């Protein structure tokens, strides 16, 4: 009944996106430091 | 007196259609509720577990009259929000006794004070709160199953009408519709519970059910399993109406959708009356002998709701970005603390319950008052943020996002610090009053063997403190996206105020800018008194806690 | 805040200091990181604690002279 | 046994409803009828006229919620134009 | 004590917990937004109910199995069952760190609840005088010396009168050497 | 009124005057900063008056006031030799903490002064209160001002730093609250005189220990729980860093003399090997990772973890020497850590805007006054003799060896590892080659402000090192009251 | 350890774990009265089963830990 | 502390906090009369809390005497 802007999960995903937390893999981040060359 | 006030206000409201008369109907409602306080104040001259009145369908207790006074005062504080204009104009030249009482000020007050705002144009708004208050003070005083059902509906039906009263709001109509529909299913559970009580006992009186339960508690063809089953269904209805998890999903949606003036009342009064009625029922349904009747105690649902309310209220609140959804979830985790002290039926827990309830009703009032005042203060401010132009019902809820409070410390420091003091009280930080409330509910549970629940409460108190701190980070850690309106201070834009003596003779004429507009004293003083109570409680605690020690001593006495 | 003096900020050292600060955001649970973590956090404290318990109150030196034994227990 | 069957029916009305908000109004009333019918049949079994009185007041409150509910539904329809849930 | 049929109890645990998850799977079918039909409870949501039976059955079976081996009934068994129950929850997700992590969280909480006492039901009542019990605790200021030496023991600076003669006896028994400290005075 | 309540009202009166002076003049920020500084000096003069009158061998709490009116929660103030020097340390630091950060604030200066003036009252109270719930009340009332001090006047990673300190300190302190509530339930009050008479059952003691130690382990802090400090101290303003290390880290040290030594003795005795195992580990790991830290201000913060562990093992020795050494090492840490924070956070960061040790080299060549004081504060961090830091470490380490020898033997390795990082940091900033090439323009040397607070802090560290009897004569009789044990021929006299 | 597992098995792993969990539970709230009504019935039945089947209280805690960890997993 | 003083200052503190929220000037001369008024209201609420405390003390004292007669009458009847 309410707008998606107010109760929708979609705008949670903009305030708290999953991209806020890195998930680099062994190929991307073997030194486990951020991909620092 | 509440019934004399409703009928008198109703007759006056019935013969008028003027929307300018709303201001004065809310003022007379405050005066009417003050007479109710003076009548109930005289009804405290006896020591009694209870006296049955009007054929045994009602009762009076020291706790009933104490909390009739509390309900009337909380209503008076909320009623001010519609009894006085949000902003005022003040000049040092009109500030003395001679000026305020004998002189007069003339100026165009319409756009400055918001004379014709939506809240100042509902004639029956003061009337419908009185109807809700009436059902609240009846629930507290009900001694019969029928009176319980009739009182709970009187309160519920008026709360639905409050949520739908802003008829031009497509958010308020939805919220009231959600509330009536999920509230009606709750009413069936309360009605099923009382019906199943009468069919197995032949009685509608609480005292007969108390004596039937009393005799059954001894460590054959009629084993009384019905009382703990009936009260269990009966508890689901009231758990919904206080929004205890898992029956909680409605409150964040309804509290977010209706106007902020309305949610102050809707989110406070209902929990005051429901929690008082449950306390007396928990006491006289207790088991003094551990038997098979005690294994099916209805009070277990309150212990599971409390555990679930502590977790849901603090965990789901982490990712909320809308302030009224956040405060809705904060209330859920606070009733998990209230429900834990109710479920432990001990002298200490009952005293902790009376304090947690009163202090939290007062503190959650300050949070709503500060929010309403912050929205009425951005009148002299402009924003270019894109996320604010897309908001809905910006007059019913001026502050909807926690992003809108970014940099309020710069705009208003003590208003920001008042909200800081209130928020830290919700966390439980000493020396603030909210700490002493949680302290008493942790010590009661620990002394009675609810150690596992106490550990869960302090863990969620850390989790719930995360989203409380996020609001503080917004107000103080960042600069404001709100900037002063450029036109209100252009050096050529002034409004003429005239000073007039008693016989309308011009004493003086003053030139005023937007800097001479401030918050109305009714909202500034109310915020000031409660913030001080939260801050200075450790110097003024004797008579507040002594009242609760005496009320519980009468209830447990003999 | 206050203006500081001019420093030739090395882009290479600045990005290195940034790397050290955000490094935790990229820690994973591997067979190696678990092995180092288990050794340091469990094994060494448990070994130190075990010796602490076994030798606790075992010896006293005060006023002990020849013909007496250091061992209390 | 009839009173319990009808209470299930009102409950199953909520179980089987994703779109009708009208049918939730109807299912609340079926539940009220079952509970009043139970009180009424147990009243005849115990020779108690007070059950008949409690049934009467449940009918009055039931109609009053119907009025309050259909009025709120009218307020909602005026601004929305549909009583349908977008599921 | 009376041995418990672990297999018989294990089925009860799987059915009770797996029954509730079957009720949870049913909500998923009812709330599904497409025409999935009635048999979607056992095809699309079957894994949800299946893991509930797996988790519940492993907990009660391992709790019962733990009790038989240790020949005792206490809060410890609620730890073994919780560890194996949490391990089963981690097996579904297929991630090693969580197999161990979920077992840790489940085992700690299910043992902490039991060792504290059952909060979710009616707490045990001692059925005694609370005023006498509390007052005894507040006024039990001194205790027999034997009472304290039982928990801490002599040594570590707790040298009760007679410690040296006892230590001589203790040292003689274990070291086989008589203690005889030297004089330090050439005269007498 | 009493003289211990004058200690609390003066910082409150200063808050009022800063708030009302603008209403009598648009007033300068220099006028706000003189009010706050004169207010802190008056508290220091009162505290020196209290110390002149104080009886060094009295077993009754002194400068108390006859309440005679009892409520649910009531403030009871008193002083004993165990607490007098903690009060004095708070009243000597707060004036320097203000002077150190005199130019560095710039914005929100009234708010900054009000928080420090409020912190001084709350930290003074926590030493003066004669109840254990009142101790908790002030031991945790400092968390809201410190959340906002870091957020308003902190460095770049301030938001996360302030969330860490508040949430860890809130979580850790809520296990202390459960233990305190249990003792109050069993005894009926938390007033010290009544609680210290009471003896708990061993099992109650062993569970009250689990909950006071969990709180203290988070607030010491121990090695695996020290993340909040590595963030809080570094991102905090200079003044907040001085308070948090010198005064707040000492609240747990003084809380063992109240919450554990006198009321849970059997639990403290039978669990010391767990404490010593943790204390030993946090001596080694903290020191190994202080060697490889590249942020100077975070190298001073890590050093604090290693020192707190020496004084924590000292409080758990059941010895008169390790208990007084623990208080001496906490007083010594208060002066030296203050100076090293002033050097890193208040002189280098002021001139460079950087904390990375990569950019600093040969600073003695252009700043010879800074390098002289910096050397003396590095030697005290290393526990060199002639500084109070050596006396505290020696007595703290001896009682550790006398209690459980093996752990004091590992803990004694702090003599090699504190020296290692202290000289290595020194040789890399003051020495280590010629003035760096990353410095485009020359840096001025110490100001008359920077010189005189560094000189004042060094003066306390050295003079108290020569004659520690200035502090030792006050603690002797009062320390004598927290020892648990008997001797076979000295006890049970007839 | 300090920048690794102590922050993963600690504040940073509790942060990223709980934020994921709270988004999933918050996605159960779709503001549909039909779906909210179903939830009330569900939460009603679970209370009825618990206080009539005399189930061991531990069976409940397993349910809560199962439920909480199911919202810990995405998709 | 003294209740009359605490409440008198409480009213003084409420006036101070009010003007701080409204961001109005503390200490305008033609509006100084509010400080005696706010404090005077504070003093009055305090004489009332003094009457409340006096009566609460009497009744809490009675109750402690009642719990002691009950525990004693019960103890006496258990001597048989
Ligand atoms: C625990 C509890 C402990 C309590 C201890 C004491 C606490 C501190 C004392 C509080 C006193 C508040 C009342 C006095 C007050 O407002 O004086 C300032 C006020 C003028 O100062 P101002 O704020 O600069 O005025 C701005 C303009 O007047 C323009 O102002 P405005 O138009 O925005 O509104 C003016 C006025 C509107 O209301 C009235 O006219 C007040 C009517 C009160 C009697 C009915 O507002 C108020 O008075 C709000 C008071 C809220 C009280 C309830 C809070 C909860 O005084 C008046 O002119 C009010 C009438 C004089 C007092 C008569 C009644 C005295 C007893 C009242 C008992 C209630
Ligand atoms: C932070 C909280 C903010 C709350 C805002 C309100 C502040 C006060 C908080 C509640 C305090 C308790 C109020 C109870 C009602 C007031 C009673 C009182 O103070 O005096 C009793 C007196 C009663 O006096 P009386 O006239 O009935 O009889 C007097 C009897 N002798 C002679 C012995 C004194 O005041 C009243 O008249 C009661 C009516 C109060 C009107 C509405 C008050 C609302 C507040
Ligand atoms: C011990 C139990 C109690 C502790 C439990 C811990 C729960 C912590 C929940 C933290 C919720 C907020 O956590 C944080 O919020 C801020 C809000 O901008 C965001 O923080 C983020 O900021 C920027 C964007 O501005 C991101 O690029 C960055 O990756 C991150 O730091 C993230 O959304 C989230 O990392
Ligand atoms: C912080 C907010 C301000 C403080 C809040 C509390 C102030 C008011 C507390 C009042 C309750 C306790 O104070 C007292 O309690 C008893 C309880 O029956 C009542 O006392 C009443 O009955 C008794 C017994 O017949 C009479 O002796 C007494 O004259 C009468 O007033 C009154 O209520 C009050 O005299
Ligand atoms: C300063 C920090 C360190 C101080 C604490 C460490 C002190 C270490 C003391 C070690 C010796 C203790 O006391 C010592 O114990 C050993 C056994 O281990 C025993 O040694 C004995 O061994 C043989 C039997 O094998 C005996 O026949 C012989 O008489 C004696 O040498 C004696 O009891 C004593 O010589
Ligand atoms: C991590 C979480 C760890 C578990 C939480 C702490 C549990 C503490 O709970 C502990 O339980 C034991 C069980 O009787 C009790 O401990 C004590 O209880 C009473 C004393 O009143 C004694 O008769 C009993 O012999 C003794 O064991 C206390 O209730 C408490 O000391
Ligand atoms: C329990 C809650 C937590 C308590 C923690 C302690 C918080 C202490 C905060 C101090 C009080 C607020 O501090 C307040 O800051 C605001 C900043 O907008 C100042 O207000 C002023 O600041 C500067 C002064 O030049 C102006 O540019 C600005 O326009 C104006 O608003 C107030 O004069 C000051 O008093
Ligand atoms: C690693 C940390 C592990 C522990 C962390 C959490 C513990 C924090 C402090 C818990 C204190 C122990 O728990 C406390 O113990 C005492 C006795 O010992 C209990 O006292 C007792 O109360 C009831 C009532 O008589 C008794 O029936 C019961 O035997 C016991 O619970 C307290 O009710 C309990 O609150
Ligand atoms: C024993 C286990 C641990 C005990 C409890 C300790 C829990 C501590 C958890 C704190 C988690 C961090 O808390 C969260 O941090 C992020 C930073 O990444 C903040 O996010 C903030 O900083 C980022 C940094 O880029 C900026 O974009 C911006 O200022 C804001 O988004 C959140 O506002 C805060 O809520
Ligand atoms: C000396 C140690 C002291 C520790 C004191 C107590 C610290 C807090 C204990 C629990 C800490 C949380 O622990 C952490 O939880 C979350 C669960 O979502 C997990 O966090 C992570 O899980 C997996 C990694 O396995 C990731 O893919 C996922 O992105 C992330 O959520 C971590 O696997 C776990 O390390």
Automatic annotation (TrEMBL), chain A:
<protein>
    <submittedName>
        <fullName>NADH dehydrogenase (Ubiquinone)-like protein</fullName>
    </submittedName>
</protein>
<feature type="region of interest" description="Disordered">
    <location>
        <begin position="17"/>
        <end position="37"/>
    </location>
</feature>
TrEMBL record, chain D:
<dbReference type="GO" id="GO:0030964">
    <property type="term" value="C:NADH dehydrogenase complex"/>
</dbReference>
<keyword id="KW-0472">Membrane</keyword>
<keyword id="KW-1133">Transmembrane helix</keyword>
<comment type="function">
    <text>Core subunit of the mitochondrial membrane respiratory chain NADH dehydrogenase (Complex I) that is believed to belong to the minimal assembly required for catalysis. Complex I functions in the transfer of electrons from NADH to the respiratory chain. The immediate electron acceptor for the enzyme is believed to be ubiquinone.</text>
</comment>
<keyword id="KW-0999">Mitochondrion inner membrane</keyword>
<dbReference type="Pfam" id="PF00420">
    <property type="entry name" value="Oxidored_q2"/>
</dbReference>
<dbReference type="GO" id="GO:0016651">
    <property type="term" value="F:oxidoreductase activity, acting on NAD(P)H"/>
</dbReference>
<feature type="transmembrane region" description="Helical">
    <location>
        <begin position="20"/>
        <end position="42"/>
    </location>
</feature>
<keyword id="KW-0813">Transport</keyword>
<comment type="function">
    <text>Core subunit of the mitochondrial membrane respiratory chain NADH dehydrogenase (Complex I) which catalyzes electron transfer from NADH through the respiratory chain, using ubiquinone as an electron acceptor.</text>
</comment>
<keyword id="KW-0812">Transmembrane</keyword>
<dbReference type="GO" id="GO:0005743">
    <property type="term" value="C:mitochondrial inner membrane"/>
</dbReference>
UniProtKB/TrEMBL annotation, chain F:
<keyword id="KW-0812">Transmembrane</keyword>
<dbReference type="GO" id="GO:0015990">
    <property type="term" value="P:electron transport coupled proton transport"/>
</dbReference>
<dbReference type="GO" id="GO:0008137">
    <property type="term" value="F:NADH dehydrogenase (ubiquinone) activity"/>
</dbReference>
<protein>
    <recommendedName>
        <fullName>NADH-ubiquinone oxidoreductase chain 4</fullName>
        <ecNumber>7.1.1.2</ecNumber>
    </recommendedName>
</protein>
<feature type="transmembrane region" description="Helical">
    <location>
        <begin position="242"/>
        <end position="261"/>
    </location>
</feature>
<keyword id="KW-0472">Membrane</keyword>
<keyword id="KW-0679">Respiratory chain</keyword>
<comment type="function">
    <text>Core subunit of the mitochondrial membrane respiratory chain NADH dehydrogenase (Complex I) that is believed to belong to the minimal assembly required for catalysis. Complex I functions in the transfer of electrons from NADH to the respiratory chain. The immediate electron acceptor for the enzyme is believed to be ubiquinone.</text>
</comment>
<dbReference type="InterPro" id="IPR003918">
    <property type="entry name" value="NADH_UbQ_OxRdtase"/>
</dbReference>
<keyword id="KW-0520">NAD</keyword>
<feature type="transmembrane region" description="Helical">
    <location>
        <begin position="299"/>
        <end position="320"/>
    </location>
</feature>
<dbReference type="Pfam" id="PF00361">
    <property type="entry name" value="Proton_antipo_M"/>
</dbReference>
UniProtKB/TrEMBL annotation, chain G:
<feature type="transmembrane region" description="Helical">
    <location>
        <begin position="33"/>
        <end position="50"/>
    </location>
</feature>
<comment type="similarity">
    <text>Belongs to the complex I subunit 5 family.</text>
</comment>
<protein>
    <recommendedName>
        <fullName>NADH-ubiquinone oxidoreductase chain 5</fullName>
    </recommendedName>
</protein>
<comment type="function">
    <text>Core subunit of the mitochondrial membrane respiratory chain NADH dehydrogenase (Complex I) that is believed to belong to the minimal assembly required for catalysis. Complex I functions in the transfer of electrons from NADH to the respiratory chain. The immediate electron acceptor for the enzyme is believed to be ubiquinone.</text>
</comment>
<comment type="function">
    <text>Core subunit of the mitochondrial membrane respiratory chain NADH dehydrogenase (Complex I) which catalyzes electron transfer from NADH through the respiratory chain, using ubiquinone as an electron acceptor. Essential for the catalytic activity and assembly of complex I.</text>
</comment>
<feature type="transmembrane region" description="Helical">
    <location>
        <begin position="57"/>
        <end position="74"/>
    </location>
</feature>
């Amino acid at each position: 009944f309410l707008p998606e802007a107010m109760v929708g999960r979609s705008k949670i995903d903009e305030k708290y996106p999953d991209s806020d937390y890195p998930t680099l893999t062994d190929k991307e981040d073997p030194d486990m430091n951020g991909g620092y060359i | 007196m509440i019934m004399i006030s409703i009928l008198s206000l109703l007759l006056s409201t019935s013969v008028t259609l003027r929307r300018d008369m709303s201001i004065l109907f809310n003022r007379i409602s405050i005066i009417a509720l003050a007479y109710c306080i003076l009548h109930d104040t005289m009804s405290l001259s006896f020591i009694s577990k209870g006296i049955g009145l009007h054929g045994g369908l009602l009762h009076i207790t020291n706790l009933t009259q104490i909390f009739h006074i509390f309900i009337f005062i909380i209503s008076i504080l909320i009623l001010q929000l519609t009894s006085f204009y949000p902003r005022k104009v003040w000049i040092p030249e009109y500030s003395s006794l001679k000026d305020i009482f004998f002189n007069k000020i003339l100026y165009y007050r319409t756009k400055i004070i918001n004379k014709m705002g939506e809240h100042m144009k509902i004639i029956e708004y003061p009337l419908i709160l009185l109807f809700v208050i009436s059902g609240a003070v009846f629930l507290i005083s009900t001694n019969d199953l029928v009176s319980i059902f009739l009182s709970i509906e009187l309160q519920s039906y008026g709360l639905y009408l409050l949520s739908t009263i802003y008829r031009n709001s497509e958010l308020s109509t939805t919220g009231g519709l959600i509330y009536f529909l999920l509230g009606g299913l709750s009413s069936c559970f309360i009605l099923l519970g009382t019906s199943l009580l009468y069919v197995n006992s032949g009685t509608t009186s609480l005292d007969g059910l108390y004596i039937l339960n009393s005799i059954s508690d001894v460590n054959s063809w009629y084993k009384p399993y019905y009382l703990n089953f009936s009260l269990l269904i009966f508890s689901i209805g009231f758990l919904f109406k206080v929004s205890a998890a898992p029956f909680h999903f409605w409150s964040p949606d309804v509290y977010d959708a209706i106007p902020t003036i309305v949610t102050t009342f809707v989110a406070i009064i209902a929990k005051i009356s429901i929690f008082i009625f449950l306390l007396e029922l928990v006491y006289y349904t207790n088991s003094n002998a551990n038997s098979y009747l005690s294994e099916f105690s209805w009070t277990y649902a309150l212990l599971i709701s409390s555990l679930l309310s502590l977790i849901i209220g603090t965990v789901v609140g982490l990712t909320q970005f809308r302030i009224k959804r956040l405060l809705a979830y904060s209330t859920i985790s606070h009733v998990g603390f209230i429900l834990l002290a109710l479920s432990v039926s001990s002298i200490e827990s009952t005293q902790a319950f009376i304090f947690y309830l009163i202090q939290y009703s007062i503190s959650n009032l300050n949070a709503f008052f500060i929010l309403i005042t912050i929205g009425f203060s951005l009148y002299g401010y402009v924003t270019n943020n894109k996320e604010y132009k897309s908001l809905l019902d910006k007059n019913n809820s001026p502050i909807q996002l926690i992003s809108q409070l970014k940099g309020y410390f710069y705009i208003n420091p003590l208003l920001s610090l008042s909200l800081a003091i209130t928020i830290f009280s919700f966390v439980g930080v000493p020396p603030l009053v909210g700490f002493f409330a949680k302290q008493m509910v942790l010590s009661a549970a620990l002394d009675n063997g609810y150690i596992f629940l106490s550990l869960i409460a302090i863990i969620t108190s850390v989790i719930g403190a995360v989203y409380y701190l996020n609001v503080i980070k917004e107000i103080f850690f960042y600069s404001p996206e709100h900037e002063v309106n450029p036109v209100l201070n252009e050096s050529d834009s002034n409004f003429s105020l005239r000073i007039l003596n008693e016989k309308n003779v011009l004493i003086r004429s003053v030139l005023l800018k937007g800097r001479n507009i401030f918050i109305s004293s009714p909202f500034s003083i109310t915020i000031s008194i409660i913030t001080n109570v939260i801050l200075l409680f450790i110097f003024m605690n004797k008579e507040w806690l002594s009242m609760g020690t005496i009320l519980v001593q009468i209830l447990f006495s003999a | 805040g206050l203006q500081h003096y001019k420093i030739a900020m090395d882009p290479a050292l600045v990005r290195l200091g940034s790397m050290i600060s955000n490094r935790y955001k990229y820690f994973r649970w591997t067979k190696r990181t678990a092995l180092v973590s288990f050794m340091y956090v469990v094994v060494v404290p448990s070994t130190i604690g075990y010796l602490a318990y076994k030798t606790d109150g075992l010896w006293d030196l005060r006023a002990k002279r020849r013909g007496d034994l250091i061992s209390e227990r | 046994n009839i009173t319990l069957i009808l209470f299930l029916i009102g409950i199953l009305g909520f179980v089987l409803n994703r779109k009708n908000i009208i049918l939730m109004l109807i299912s609340i009333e079926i539940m009220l009828l079952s509970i009043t019918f139970l009180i009424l049949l147990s009243s005849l079994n115990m020779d108690d006229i007070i059950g008949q009185t409690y049934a009467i007041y449940i009918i009055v409150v039931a109609g009053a919620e119907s009025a309050i509910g259909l009025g709120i539904l009218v307020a909602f329809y005026r601004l929305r134009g549909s009583i349908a849930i977008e599921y | 004590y009376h041995p418990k049929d672990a297999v018989h109890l294990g089925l009860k645990g799987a059915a009770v917990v797996g029954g509730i998850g079957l009720l949870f799977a049913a909500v998923r079918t009812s709330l599904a937004r497409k025409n999935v039909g009635p048999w979607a409870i056992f095809t699309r949501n079957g894994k949800l109910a299946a893991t509930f039976a797996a988790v519940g059955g492993a907990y009660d079976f391992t709790r019962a199995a733990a009790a038989n081996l240790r020949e005792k009934e206490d809060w410890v068994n609620n730890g073994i069952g919780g560890l194996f129950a949490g391990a089963t929850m981690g097996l579904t997700t297929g991630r090693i760190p969580r197999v161990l992590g979920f077992a840790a969280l489940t085992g700690v909480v299910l043992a902490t609840a039991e060792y504290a006492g059952s909060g979710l039901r009616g707490v045990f009542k001692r059925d005694v005088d609370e005023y006498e019990r509390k007052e005894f605790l507040r006024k039990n200021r001194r205790r027999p010396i034997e009472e304290t030496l039982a928990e801490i023991g002599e040594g570590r600076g707790i040298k009760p009168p007679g410690y040296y003669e006892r230590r001589a006896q203790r040292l003689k028994e274990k070291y086989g050497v008589d203690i005889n400290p030297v004089c330090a005075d050439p005269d007498q | 009124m009493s003289l211990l309540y004058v200690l609390l009202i003066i910082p409150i009166i200063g808050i009022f005057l800063i708030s009302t002076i603008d209403s009598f003049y648009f007033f300068n920020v220099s006028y706000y900063k003189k009010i706050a500084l004169i207010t802190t000096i008056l508290n220091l003069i009162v505290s020196l008056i209290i110390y002149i009158l104080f009886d060094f061998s009295n077993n009754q709490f002194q400068f108390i006031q006859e309440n005679l009116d009892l409520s649910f929660y009531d403030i009871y103030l008193g002083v004993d030799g165990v607490s007098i020097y903690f009060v004095l340390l708070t009243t000597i630091i707060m004036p320097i903490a203000l002077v150190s950060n005199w130019n560095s604030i710039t914005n929100n200066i009234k708010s900054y002064l009000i928080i420090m003036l409020l912190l001084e009252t709350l930290l003074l109270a926590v030493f003066l209160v004669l109840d254990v719930l009142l101790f908790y009340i002030f031991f945790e009332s400092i968390l809201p001002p410190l959340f906002i001090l870091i957020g308003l006047f902190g460095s770049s990673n301030k938001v996360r730093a302030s969330f860490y300190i508040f949430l860890y300190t809130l979580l850790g302190s809520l296990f202390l609250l459960l233990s305190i509530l249990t003792m109050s339930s069993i005894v009926g009050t938390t007033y010290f005189d009544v609680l210290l008479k009471s003896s708990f059952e061993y099992t109650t003691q062993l569970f009250l220990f689990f909950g006071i130690f969990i709180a203290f382990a988070v607030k010491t802090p121990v090695w695996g729980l020290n993340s909040w400090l590595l963030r809080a101290h570094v991102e905090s303003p200079l003044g907040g860093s001085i308070v948090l290390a010198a005064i707040v880290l000492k609240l747990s040290l003084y809380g063992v003399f109240r919450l554990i030594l006198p009321i849970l003795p059997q639990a403290s005795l039978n669990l010391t090997y767990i404490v010593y195992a943790i204390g030993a580990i946090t001596v080694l790991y903290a020191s190994f990772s202080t060697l490889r830290t590249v942020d100077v201000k975070e190298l001073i913060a890590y050093s604090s973890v290693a020192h707190a562990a020496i004084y924590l093992m000292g409080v758990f020795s059941n010895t008169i020497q390790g208990l007084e050494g623990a208080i001496l090492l906490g007083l010594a840490h208060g002066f030296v850590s203050s100076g090293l924070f002033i050097c890193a956070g208040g002189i280098l960061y002021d001139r460079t805007g950087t904390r990375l040790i990569y950019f600093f080299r040969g600073l003695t060549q252009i700043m010879p006054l800074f390098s002289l004081f910096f050397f003396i504060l590095c030697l005290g961090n290393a526990g060199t003799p002639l500084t109070l830091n050596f006396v505290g470490e020696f007595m703290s380490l001896y009682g550790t060896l006398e209690r459980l020898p093996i752990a004091g033997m590992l803990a004694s390795t702090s003599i090699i590892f504190s020296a290692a990082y202290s000289i290595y940091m020194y040789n890399r900033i003051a020495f280590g080659g010629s003035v760096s090439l990353y410095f485009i323009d020359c840096f001025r040397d110490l100001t008359k402000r920077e010189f005189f607070i560094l000189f004042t802090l060094v003066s306390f560290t050295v003079i108290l090192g020569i004659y520690p009897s200035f502090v030792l004569d006050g603690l002797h009789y009062n320390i004598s009251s927290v020892v648990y044990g008997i001797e076979p021929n000295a006890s049970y006299l007839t | 350890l300090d920048k690794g597992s102590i922050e993963l098995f600690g504040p940073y792993g509790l942060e990223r774990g709980l934020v994921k969990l709270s988004k999933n539970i918050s996605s159960l709230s779709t503001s549909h009265v039909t779906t909210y009504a179903l939830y009330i019935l569900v939460g009603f039945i679970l209370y009825l089963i618990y206080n009539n089947l005399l189930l061991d209280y531990s069976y409940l805690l397993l349910i809560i830990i199962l439920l909480l960890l199911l919202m810990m997993i995405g998709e | 502390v003294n209740r009359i003083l605490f409440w008198t200052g409480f009213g003084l503190a409420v006036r101070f906090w009010q003007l701080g929220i409204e961001m109005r000037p503390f200490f305008n001369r033609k509006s100084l009369w509010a400080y005696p008024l706010f404090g005077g209201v504070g003093a009055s609420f305090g004489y009332w809390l003094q009457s409340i405390d006096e009566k609460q003390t009497k009744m809490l004292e009675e109750r402690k005497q009642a719990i002691l007669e009950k525990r004693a009458r019960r103890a006496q009847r258990q001597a048989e």
